[PDB]
Amino acid sequence: TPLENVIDVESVRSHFPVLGGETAAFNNASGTVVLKEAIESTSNFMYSFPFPPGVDAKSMEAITAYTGNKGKVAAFINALPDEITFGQSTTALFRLLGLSLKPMLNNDCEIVCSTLCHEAAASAWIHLSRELGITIKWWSPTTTPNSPDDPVLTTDSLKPLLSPKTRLVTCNHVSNVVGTIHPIREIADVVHTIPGAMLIVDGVASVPHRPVDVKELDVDFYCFSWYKLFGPHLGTLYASRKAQDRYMTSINHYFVSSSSLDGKLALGMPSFELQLMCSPIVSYLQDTVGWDRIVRQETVLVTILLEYLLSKPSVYRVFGRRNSDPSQRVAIVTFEVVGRSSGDVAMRVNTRNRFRITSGTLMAPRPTWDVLKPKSSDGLVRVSFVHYNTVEEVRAFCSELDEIVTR
Amino acid sequence: TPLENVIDVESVRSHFPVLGGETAAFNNASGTVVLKEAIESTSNFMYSFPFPPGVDAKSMEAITAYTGNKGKVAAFINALPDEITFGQSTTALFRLLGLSLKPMLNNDCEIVCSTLCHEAAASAWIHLSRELGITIKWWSPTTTPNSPDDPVLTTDSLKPLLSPKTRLVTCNHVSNVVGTIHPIREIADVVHTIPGAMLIVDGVASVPHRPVDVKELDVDFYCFSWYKLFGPHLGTLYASRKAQDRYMTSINHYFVSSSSLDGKLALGMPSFELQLMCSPIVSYLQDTVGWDRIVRQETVLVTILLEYLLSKPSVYRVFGRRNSDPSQRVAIVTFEVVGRSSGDVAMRVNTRNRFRITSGTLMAPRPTWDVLKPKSSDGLVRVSFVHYNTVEEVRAFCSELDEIVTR
């Protein structure tokens, strides 16, 4: 039978009013449409009496709403509230984590970084390394000759780079230019065979597509960005109690208690108005739509796009996993058109403005140019779906892309 | 004649709907009510098609709106757009500026810090000093025996601490626990007698109360926080072209152009939704109400509060300038009640919940405990007005405060 939508298109898209227009949103890995309920929540807070709140009954209700919001976001990733903090961005929070870790590190310790890392991560650990006088032991992904454009992160590739002096291992849960799901719990179990070693995971390309449980991942640190999750431009970093007590030094004022992650890393007054946009998104994803429908909807969308791209192997070179299986890969699909500029293809699609896609290095030169290695000087073409995208849109996009390349 | 409001109370307070309730907002130095037009602006952006924007006509109009917003904010302080950047907070932006300056500094250079500095500043320059192996040459303010609780920042106190190896001088335009206006252009002219030396000014307690022109101040760096300015929890840092080209190193990804301040200091995707709240505030302050009415309204409010406090010298010890003159001091008034806890006084006022005030160290231990030195273990009482506060409110507050202390 022809593949159809799993979601109620109208019910889901009622929360995202701009999706009714001419242009379909196929660049969600660079930023999603904001959840209506999230905007309504921040409006209500910003129209309310300002922080810092008083001791009166109405002020205590506003404190309960703030603490409640943090409690739900913490439960979203199965963390305790004192194990999470809100920041400017993942790039910022990774840099501040570096400053927190630096005092208990030195030039004798080893940092292992995945070459599939976003520069948000790479820049943090390059800067930390340079300040400590460390040279990074870079961790290359594995390709097999039958799947040369499908880079995989394996424990077997990591083990040779590990030593008794390994202290930092850094990788992503998903690469924003590949879309493959890495085996984080397996990597964590291997990293933790080295006493003193900590695993830092960039989960920016994961948390929007899959339910996350940082305790089941047994990661030391996990970080994600709400603007790829129907939310504001705002980061959230997780740090285990063990990792906080053993590895972290406060970067905050001397008089601020350093027990919580907020205490250690929170620089100035936090953006309460942006934080309170987040609990509405948690309840929307978990309860209103649910992960079963989200994953199934996104899987069907990836099936239709891969079906068309893999149908013409002489035209399209698909990077990453060449199946739509949910446990294997999320709805981030990178490819290049053989003998054509990726920029030229993206411009032609975006100029027509029926679909919004992107091309280039996508703030990830190491995975793009050192691993995937597109023939195009302009780099990769990327289409990225979320659950509010429709089968009808993907089918129409495949027709338009075909027209552009067949000309 | 009895002092009356200069503003149209109803017209001004139409932009701040929560001001109609029971509680009067007298803790504006910790956070103001958000401008209605600012909330409406961010709503419209967040309901609009997400960034990063396309090449279509409607996307280019959204780019023009973003660039236009930055252009107006830059003109608000008489800076060029490439001389300003938005950040998480003043505390964060000062810390990132430290990282940018550090590579071209060493243990032979001297950092001079005012003891009137907020810990937002102190923490930045303490951390930078510790990383470079520098000990700060702390700059004490001047008191005279006839005005012992009125600390002043003088060029004459600064000169002995200056050497040919001075590279950083740091102070605030206004202290959040004093409210006195410091002579920044005079300090700048003196700092610039030392070639290579740069002046960094914390203007968080200034920009809400007075028009600012960073070119007339001739400061190297100026920083302020929008949440004390009827806006979001969001910082803006200015850096002169000279200061950028000569003193700053990019902390951003290797592939990002370092010509603009954004290029140098912007970590991850900026919070566009919070930035676009700012141009509405610029047009509200400059054109809708205007600085003449704002300064005159705030001056009358300070006159009524000081009048009452100075009327009972045996009860109230007033810190800072004991006049309401606009060129001398802004509407931030700190005092303590003789033989009474500052905390006890604040609790009694806030519990009644007719007025919102604050007590304590207010994230400024150095000015509070090392300069002002209140007799109370609980520190200072602070009342802070902005132009939307009324003479009727201040008169009523004076009566309530009297009742609490006369008991």
DSSP secondary-structure letter at B109?
A: S
Tell me the one-letter amino acid at B372. Answer: L
3-state class (DSSP) for residue B380: strand
| Architecture of the A9-34+290-406 domain | Alpha-Beta Complex (3.90)
- Pairwise CB contact (< 8 Å): B361 & A23: no
Tell the residue number behind the tokens 């397996």, with chain if given: A186
Both structure tokens of B229: 């300015």
Tell me the one-letter amino acid at B292. Answer: D
B27 to chain A, any CB pair closer than 8 A? The answer is: yes
- Nearest-angstrom CA–CA distance, A404 and A349: 8
3-state class (DSSP) for residue A83: helix
- CA triple B35-B260-B222, angle to 5 deg: 55
Indicate the residue of B232, B356, B361 with minimum beta-carbon distance to A271: B232
3-state secondary structure A113-167: EECCCCHHHHHHHHHHHHHHCCCCEEECCEEECCEEEEEECCHHHHHHHCCCCEE
Q: Which residues 107-136 on chain B approach chain A with CB closer than 8 angstroms?
A: 119-120, 122-123, 127, 131
User: Does residue A235 contact residue A92 with C-beta atoms inside 8 Å?
Assistant: yes
Indicate the residue of A88, A119, A272 with minimum beta-carbon distance to B88: A88
Distance between B235 CA and the closest CA of chain A, angstroms: 10
User: Does residue A42 contact residue B273 with C-beta atoms inside 8 Å?
Assistant: no
| Resolution in units of Å | 2.2
Q: How far is CA A258 from the centre of its chain?
A: 27
Distance between A105 CA and the closest CA of chain B, angstroms: 14
Q: How far is CA B303 from the centre of its chain?
A: 21
Residues 6+ apart with CB under 8 A from A371: A115, A116, A140, A141, A151
Residues 6+ apart with CB under 8 A from A160: none
Both structure tokens of A195: 């006493």
Ranges of CATH 3.40.640.10 domains, chain A: 41-283
Residues 6+ apart with CB under 8 A from A402: A308
Name the residue in chain A with its Cα closest to that of B254. Answer: A123
- Pairwise CB contact (< 8 Å): B233 & A270: yes
B50 to chain A, any CB pair closer than 8 A? The answer is: yes
Method: X-ray
Distance between A213 CA and the closest CA of chain B, angstroms: 25
Name the residue in chain A with its Cα closest to that of B39. Answer: A43
Residues 6+ apart with CB under 8 A from A406: none
| Residue of B132, B233, B347, B389 for testing the chain A interface, max A β-carbons within 10 Å | B233
- Pairwise CB contact (< 8 Å): A89 & B267: yes
Tell me the one-letter amino acid at B123. Answer: S
Distance between B317 CA and the closest CA of chain A, angstroms: 25
B379 to chain A, any CB pair closer than 8 A? The answer is: no
Chain A residues near residue B363 by CB distance under 8 angstroms? 253
- Pairwise CB contact (< 8 Å): B31 & A251: no
- Pairwise CB contact (< 8 Å): B33 & A27: no
Sheet holding A332-337, edge to edge: A316-318, A332-337, A380-384, A358-360
Tell the residue number behind the tokens 């809100």, with chain if given: A86
Q: How many other CB atoms sit within 10 Å of the CB of residue A145?
A: 5
- Pairwise CB contact (< 8 Å): B271 & A234: yes
Question: Residue B314 burial by CB count (10 A; 0-12/13-18/19+): exposed, middle or buried?
Answer: exposed
- Nearest-angstrom CA–CA distance, B260 and B83: 7
Both structure tokens of A230: 């129907």
Whether omega for the bond prior to residue B160 falls within 30 degrees of 0, making it cis, is no
Question: Residue A67 burial by CB count (10 A; 0-12/13-18/19+): exposed, middle or buried?
Answer: exposed
Residues 6+ apart with CB under 8 A from A44: none
Distance between A272 CA and the closest CA of chain B, angstroms: 8
Chain B residues near residue A367 by CB distance under 8 angstroms? none
Q: How far is CA B51 from the centre of its chain?
A: 30
- Nearest-angstrom CA–CA distance, B71 and B64: 10
- Nearest-angstrom CA–CA distance, A292 and A290: 6
Q: How many other CB atoms sit within 10 Å of the CB of residue B126?
A: 18
Name the residue in chain A with its Cα closest to that of B233. Answer: A271
Just give the CATH number of B9-32+290-406.
Answer: 3.90.1150.10
Both structure tokens of A15: 């929360």
If we measure between CA atoms, which residue out of A116, A27, A1, A37 comes closest to residue A282? A37
CA A104 vs CA A93, A112, A124, A132, A247: distances in Å:
18, 17, 17, 10, 7
Ranges of CATH 3.90.1150.10 domains, chain A: 9-34+290-406
Tell me the one-letter amino acid at A319. Answer: F
User: Does residue B131 contact residue B158 with C-beta atoms inside 8 Å?
Assistant: no
- Pairwise CB contact (< 8 Å): A268 & B353: no
DSSP secondary-structure letter at B324?
A: -
Q: At what angle do helices A391-406 and A342-352 cross, to 10 degrees?
A: 120
DSSP per-residue letters across A165-184: TEEEEEEESB-TTT-BBP-H
3-state class (DSSP) for residue A72: helix
Both structure tokens of A324: 């739509």
- Nearest-angstrom CA–CA distance, B241 and B238: 10
- What is the C-alpha radius of gyration for chain B, rounded to an integer number of angstroms? 22
Residues 6+ apart with CB under 8 A from A165: A108, A109, A110
Q: How many other CB atoms sit within 10 Å of the CB of residue A322?
A: 14
DSSP secondary-structure letter at A241?
A: H
Q: How many other CB atoms sit within 10 Å of the CB of residue A407?
A: 6
Backbone torsions φ then ψ of A27, nearest 5 degrees: -135, 45
- What is the C-alpha radius of gyration for chain A, rounded to an integer number of angstroms? 22
Both structure tokens of B84: 């300003």
- Nearest-angstrom CA–CA distance, B382 and B205: 13
H or E element that contains B122: helix B119-132
Both structure tokens of A374: 């597109």
- CA triple B290-A268-A173, angle to 5 deg: 120
- Pairwise CB contact (< 8 Å): A88 & B92: yes
Fold for the domain defined by A41-283:
Aspartate Aminotransferase; domain 2 (3.40.640)
Name the residue in chain A with its Cα closest to that of B23. Answer: A49
3-state helix, strand, coil in chain B (%, to 5): 45, 15, 40
User: Does residue B176 contact residue B203 with C-beta atoms inside 8 Å?
Assistant: no
- Nearest-angstrom CA–CA distance, A277 and A264: 23
- Nearest-angstrom CA–CA distance, B76 and B238: 11
Beta carbon pairs, A and B, within 8 Å: 181
Sheet holding A235-239, edge to edge: A84-87, A235-239, A221-225, A198-202, A166-172, A110-114, A137-139
- Nearest-angstrom CA–CA distance, A231 and B297: 39
User: Does residue B96 contact residue B90 with C-beta atoms inside 8 Å?
Assistant: no
Question: Residue A157 burial by CB count (10 A; 0-12/13-18/19+): exposed, middle or buried?
Answer: middle
- Nearest-angstrom CA–CA distance, A295 and B171: 54
- Nearest-angstrom CA–CA distance, B284 and B33: 14
- Pairwise CB contact (< 8 Å): A274 & B269: no
Distance between B103 CA and the closest CA of chain A, angstroms: 10
Residues in chain A: 407
Q: Do the bridges between strand A24-25 and strand B142-144 make them parallel or antiparallel, or are there none, so unpaired?
A: unpaired
Distance between B41 CA and the closest CA of chain A, angstroms: 11
B123: region left, alpha or beta (phi > 0 left; psi from -120 to 50 alpha): alpha
Name the residue in chain A with its Cα closest to that of B277. Answer: A46
